[PDB]
Amino acid sequence: SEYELPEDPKWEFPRDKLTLGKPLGEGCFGQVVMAEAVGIDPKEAVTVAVKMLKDDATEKDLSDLVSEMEMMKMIGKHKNIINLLGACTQDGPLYVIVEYASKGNLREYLRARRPPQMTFKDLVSCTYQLARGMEYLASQKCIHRDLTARNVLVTENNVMKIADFGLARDINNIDYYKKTTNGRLPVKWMAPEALFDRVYTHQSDVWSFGVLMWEIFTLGGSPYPGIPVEELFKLLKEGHRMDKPANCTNELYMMMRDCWHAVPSQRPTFKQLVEDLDRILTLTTNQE
Amino acid sequence: PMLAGVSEYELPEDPKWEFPRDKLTLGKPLFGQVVMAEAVGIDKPKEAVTVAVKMLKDDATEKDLSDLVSEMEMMKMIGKHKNIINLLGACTQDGPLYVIVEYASKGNLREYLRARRPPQMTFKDLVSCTYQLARGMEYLASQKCIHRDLTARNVLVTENNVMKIADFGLARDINNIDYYKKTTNGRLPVKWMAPEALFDRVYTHQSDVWSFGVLMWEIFTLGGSPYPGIPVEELFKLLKEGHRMDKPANCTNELYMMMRDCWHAVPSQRPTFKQLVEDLDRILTLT
Amino acid sequence: PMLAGVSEYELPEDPKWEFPRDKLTLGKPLFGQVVMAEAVGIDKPKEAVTVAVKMLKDDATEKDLSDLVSEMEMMKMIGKHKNIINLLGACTQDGPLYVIVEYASKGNLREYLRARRPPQMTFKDLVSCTYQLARGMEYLASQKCIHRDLTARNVLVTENNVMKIADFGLARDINNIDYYKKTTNGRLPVKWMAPEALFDRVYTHQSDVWSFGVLMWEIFTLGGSPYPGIPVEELFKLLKEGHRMDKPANCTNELYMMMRDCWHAVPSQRPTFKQLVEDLDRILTLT
Amino acid sequence: SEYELPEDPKWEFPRDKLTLGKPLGEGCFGQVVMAEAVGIDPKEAVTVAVKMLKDDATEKDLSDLVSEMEMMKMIGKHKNIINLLGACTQDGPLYVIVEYASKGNLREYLRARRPPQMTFKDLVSCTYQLARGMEYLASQKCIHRDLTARNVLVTENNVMKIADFGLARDINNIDYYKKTTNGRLPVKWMAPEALFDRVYTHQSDVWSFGVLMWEIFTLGGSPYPGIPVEELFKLLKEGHRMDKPANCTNELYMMMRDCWHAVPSQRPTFKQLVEDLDRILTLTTNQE
């Protein structure tokens, strides 16, 4: 065969049962399009999203798409993680078929529902759902490395879905100590040890989660407003951190600041973040 | 003297190229982002000229930042040429990095050609476009630079329909070092890569000639996508097996043989950019 | 609770594998350095056993440190096996990283065989050595590890002449990820690399089978150097052209066909380690 | 041809005029052997050193050897830089032919001439020669990146020769800002910005020179005695530096400490180091 990907029958989807449709957008690393997959699971046609390469794809783009597919299989299913539905890997272009999220990414979702709509309780719920998704990811021995609001999708029923696992790693046995340089990660979401010390652990993902929390409570704001990525390397070393969002309580801001402790072991674990957010969410949810 | 900690930024000064931030007004958008802008005095010290500004986005990675800085550095090394987008200035101190370059009102070549397909491009125009690009590459090669990302999407077109080679973020300076067996090329567009760039960890001017051949095919197909119907996923093996693209409809046998020569498996058997310029000049004259 | 700044070291704890520094006495030397040592209680809690300790040198690089840590991590993943050098313990806290492993009194296989060439090795011994190594690799592959650096110099021999696969610094865990198109392999020994590892940015268990074939050749030549008279400098092109090593003098047609099968260009056409073990067991029994 | 290296006639040496001899040692990345080259320059046979690959050479080893050859051609000739004499690049294994230094590397040279022989003036002279070599290298727009005593050779006439350019880079036009990760450089000779900030400049080589100075004045001592490379990353960030060698004056120790300023622009330039060392050397040299 002229193709290269190995067979994995349980996940393979027939190409003649997939109808590609409207493009959902370009990621410079490939493209996602809406599609109809018959019997992907009932011989019913369900709307899905398909990720594939563009004509100017590089070997890194191809390896990233394949890595994302492999990581999703390892992670497994979870309410707060975009679900892998199947793939077309044989006799043709690589198609990774995933759950379609009609409301788009979290940043645009929040920006479109700003006040002159999102309620404070809705923001806490979003944060809780994502903490649960990350707590699950970490328990599956996966480090995401690219947790941003743009990389979270929202379903028609407003469910938060962590997505974009192309940069994620499997740390079940190897932790890449001193060999993960991290030059392809978004600087404004990176923990200091990821930027300077060639490591990346679950605690580094906790730092990114703190930045994601800030994005949520600013209803889709861009991190470190007015501070170019160009001067952030030295500012971070100097202890500078983002300020408190207007629609954030002291308790939630202290949580963000704790995720940003310089010492990784001083940051909360995702298990602890889930416990605290469950308490806060419950108390902010009307019980009448 | 300078006190310590005056700037938290990192780029060194280069006064001759530095442009005042207060003289630049960023406009509508057009790895990073490019936006139109007005630059006062970059040319008449009071006249505002329309330019393009490349900068980082909020989700910039260290590779993105190093690529933008590398592009700026390569443009200074290469120097000015009619068929290369020219660097006009840069804001590198006390703020975000802005690389200011010539604005090309007609967009990239791919789109340019696609929008001018028969229902306004003439055969002579296609040959002219190809010759201009061969001249730009001959100059770039003489300046000891390998571009590595030559595609029609990376060629811009000005108001006066001048072809401008752009996007030097992946380019390398091979004046003294050639990166033999240490350039893995995983960030280059597969459909434009020579076999030795894909498999053998090298990249020479002859690898750019292979890319030029693909660009020629894109041009004579009026912005068509290379290896139609062939996924990049199976191209690695097809290329080793000797497969090559077919002749575009609006292409003469002479021009197609030129493309095929750029795709010889053995790099030294491909023409040099100097030879391509000489041949295209002759063809253009006889057209 | 723990106060901050108690340790300036970086490795996380793993108690079950940690060995007391005061129970380890470093001896004479044997990327880093390996030295003999005496470890009290690593086995009788009062008995000192002779072991080998791998550690960094004063000119260690971050790659050297990450490689030593990776080797330690891979050995824990792989688990114990008769034909794999076993990990005994490690000192990772409050001091230099010491990876403590089984001491093999007879050195590496290359030297072992060279010192036993006819003026004490028998044909049966060579087959036995090969089978033992096939068994070790079959186990490693079942544990979803790709070694990537299988050479006779990376095989150690114990006092009881047991073959032990060693040097897991370049090994990878492919339980869930296979590194497709992202493993460039520039740090692997060229003369032991499968063509797809050299040219196609992949590495699978079938690539280790190719290396195993080269190891078989090293074994039946009593520690000879692969591709004699052929510089690594011209091997890239020779390999693409289909060239393969000749049959060693002390090798039967059957064993040579096995080597040639490990060197099939198409990876799926090579035997699996499981098949190699089954075939070698039969040959060994008929010898 | 089955080989890959391009021709460069002016430097090519005939293989039949080169006789390989005794091995000078293994560098794990290749091997160096003594040899006789006839007419390499007079049809006289001069003793030279030849660097070549070993049978287990990797692609990095091959690319490093070729890079070293290319860098030496760019640097040019200098009294304090090991001289490239020629190479055999066609129709056979790559041989890079260089000046033979009979006294070996500087670390062993100093250790073999310790006191129960080196004089203090000799140590200052060694340091001055190396500063001159580096001042020249930097003016040629080259960053060495691997300046250690083991990487300095000494000739029969006690001339200091900077060697091992396999990790060096040409920064005539490109400076590799934020794209030089430096994971293959010896940690104990690395400036903090080289370790943490993905950059490498001439000022980073000045830091390494300070460590080399310490090696010289301890007569071949190993840097950061008793401090494992494993804990140096955090100790460096915390401002820790090596102590003053016994046979070092306050003036020379202040020079070392200045080479180790955390801020690169605060370190002296090689031009300044050469000027100060020339003064110190002159004053320590008997003028009777």
Ligand SMILES: CP(=O)(O)OP(=O)(O)OC[C@H]1O[C@@H](n2cnc3c(N)ncnc32)[C@H](O)[C@@H]1O
């Ligand atoms: C941030 P980027 O690299 O563009 O990210 P990507 O290219 O994956 O997505 C491009 C567009 O398609 C959207 N998108 C990606 N995956 C899905 C999906 N599964 N369902 C709905 N929209 C998606 C994404 O939010 C964005 O609007």
Ligand SMILES: CP(=O)(O)OP(=O)(O)OC[C@H]1O[C@@H](n2cnc3c(N)ncnc32)[C@H](O)[C@@H]1O
């Ligand atoms: C190939 P890519 O990564 O999209 O390239 P880039 O990130 O520079 O995208 C810039 C967009 O604006 C266009 N563009 C880039 N530079 C200029 C310029 N100097 N003048 C006019 N248009 C430009 C370019 O063709 C594309 O449409």
Ligand SMILES: CP(=O)(O)OP(=O)(O)OC[C@H]1O[C@@H](n2cnc3c(N)ncnc32)[C@H](O)[C@@H]1O
């Ligand atoms: C192939 P290399 O990089 O030399 O490999 P290494 O750096 O481990 O060198 C170690 C030296 O001591 C030998 N050696 C390594 N490990 C052991 C061991 N566990 N027992 C006995 N000898 C060993 C090894 O064969 C070589 O001679």
Ligand SMILES: CP(=O)(O)OP(=O)(O)OC[C@H]1O[C@@H](n2cnc3c(N)ncnc32)[C@H](O)[C@@H]1O
């Ligand atoms: C530190 P390493 O990697 O072994 O360094 P290398 O392998 O280049 O050198 C190995 C041995 O050969 C010595 N050597 C290298 N080059 C020369 C030379 N040009 N003249 C004399 N000895 C040399 C070097 O000092 C050491 O003793």
